[PDB]
Symmetry: C2
Subunit: 198 residues, 2 copies
């Protein structure tokens, strides 16, 4: 007797993985948005507004990520950033229709793990490389980069679980925006537990 059927949990995770993006300059398109939001995790898809009479978007779009943590970082780091001369606005989807309690439950369950999300991981870095660097903040239980199911090549992001909460807190504070391999890592605390639907 926990909270949220696997089906309810999956629906919440889906909503948690998308961010609303508004005030998009008329000349900007999907490719621009993608480039700007990709640093937080590879973009799964983008739903861009569109008007058939004017033949242009309506100034907003929904960017969907592969995991909730990417949307959380984009939310905290991309709001008010200037794109095409306008400060874009980023927010959570206004539609949640009763999903909020499940989302809250997931966030609560997440606190039971000292797990952090790391994005913008250079292609040449390996699991062991990431582990070594990050174990500088404390003992690590596991460090795993997400990988393409077909190629086996990592997708530029992963999760690291620490034995101690102090270690995870230190890592986030020190490694978010850390320049590694030419790009800047984006790092944040997990917003969901490791195997949410289990």
């Amino acid at each position: 007797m926990g909270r949220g059927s696997a089906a309810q949990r999956q629906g919440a995770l889906a909503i948690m993985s998308r961010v609303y993006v508004g005030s998009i300059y008329y000349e900007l398109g999907e490719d621009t948005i993608r480039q700007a939001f990709a640093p937080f995790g590879p973009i799964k898809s983008i739903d861009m507004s569109w008007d058939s009479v004017t033949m242009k978007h309506k100034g907003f779009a929904f960017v969907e990520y592969e995991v909730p943590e990417a949307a959380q970082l984009a939310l905290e780091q991309m709001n008010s950033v200037m794109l095409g001369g306008r400060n874009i606005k980023v927010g959570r989807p206004s539609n949640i229709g009763q999903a909020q309690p499940i989302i809250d439950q997931l966030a609560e369950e997440a606190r039971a793990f000292n797990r952090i999300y790391v994005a913008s991981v250079h292609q040449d870095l390996s699991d062991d490389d990431i582990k070594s660097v990050f174990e500088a903040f404390g003992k690590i239980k596991s460090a795993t980069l997400a990988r393409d199911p077909t190629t086996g090549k990592h997708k530029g992001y992963g999760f690291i679980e620490y034995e101690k909460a102090q270690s995870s807190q230190d890592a986030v504070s020190s490694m978010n925006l850390f320049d590694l391999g030419g790009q800047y890592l984006r790092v944040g605390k997990a917003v969901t537990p490791p195997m949410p639907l289990l």
Copy 2:
């Protein structure tokens, strides 16, 4: 050096305001004030106004006493739900050449291990604040802003640490720290301590 005293003050003024949008029609100044006050006492609010329809236009500009309050509000109030709508928070779109000075100030700020602390309960004193925060490292100074007339602190202040690691640890540990009933709002300084003074070299 970048910017004279006049240019610097103009930038500081812009840096102290945040645009607030998507405000539900039923909500007014009042509600915005209560929602944004945790980051520092509000100096004023410029609310949009239609008049023909006798309602506001859904946006407002909240002005704080210091740039650091606007910085925290920007990071913590965006997408917060108010009146059923997720409000939007951003920097003023008007900067007209002030950006380079704003950048200069941010660069100058990194030379100090200074942090901003807001939502400080009225009963806490400077030494109380110092004691709590010195748990992260040696402190050069801890000072709460005070009313020029009464001498009563305004619920916010700045702390300068000897070491950068100490300031970093403090922000990570004390932002949203429950103290005296309210939650502290803490962040790194975005301006150097006496921005319009001299300086030298």
